Every structure is written in structure tokens, then in C-alpha cells.
DNA sequence: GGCGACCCGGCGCCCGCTACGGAGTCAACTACGGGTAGGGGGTATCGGGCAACGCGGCACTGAACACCGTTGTCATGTGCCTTG
């Protein structure tokens, strides 16, 4: 949960560079993990409710 | 000396189903004694295979009577002829 100083200046049509793709993957993997954990927590909440 | 944090234990859980891999593993010994269990051996008991022989309808046995039907049969009555 930090921010980079040099944000991605390229669109997916032009295509990201190497480091741009890497620093995007940094957030993509975290998003997938968050989705999994939120799904589990929502299921448990539904059961309790 | 009850409050107090803090500390610690101790516990409680941690979406849904299908469908989707195998793998399987390190250190005694003998003597006895019985008893059960197996085997064959022999034996009392139960189960399977055949013609008379139970029946029954009727059928024959007609035999021996019965049931009408029949032409046997008889002694006894009309009609004509002869004589009172």
C-alpha cells in the first residue's frame, strides 16, 4: 500500500514497458489475493447471519 | 488487597460443490503341554423308484322277471232247416 513516483504513462494499446508491466503485476497479484480472502470472509459472514 | 494491565493460555473460526495424482517402510528364544481340530471309519436314519390297488361310471351280466300286445282257446250263444 504505497505509490510509485513515475506512474505508467502508456496505454494497453501502445503496450506497457518491462518495469511498467512488473509494477502493474505488483498490484494485480494483490488484487487476486484480496478477492480470494474477501470471498472467504463473505461466506463466513453469510453463514453467521 | 482489590485494581490493573498484561500476560498468557486457550480457544474459535477460517465461501461452495464437483472433479482430480500417487504413495505406504528399521532391532529374542525354546521348551512344553494341552486342546481343538482335522482325517477316515463305520452306522442309524431319512429319501427316492416301481406295480397293484383304491375308486366310479357305466356297462355288461342278461338273468330274471315284469308290461303291454297278441291270436291262442273255449264252452257256449244266433240263424237256418227239418219235423212236430
Curated annotation (Swiss-Prot):
Superkingdom of origin organism: Bacteria
Transmembrane segments: none
Family to which this protein belongs: Belongs to the RNA polymerase beta' chain family.
Subunit structure: The RNAP catalytic core consists of 2 alpha, 1 beta, 1 beta' and 1 omega subunit. When a sigma factor is associated with the core the holoenzyme is formed, which can initiate transcription.
Chain's role: DNA-dependent RNA polymerase catalyzes the transcription of DNA into RNA using the four ribonucleoside triphosphates as substrates.
Protein name: DNA-directed RNA polymerase subunit beta'
The species this protein was found in: Streptomyces coelicolor (strain ATCC BAA-471 / A3(2) / M145)
Gene name in the database record: rpoC
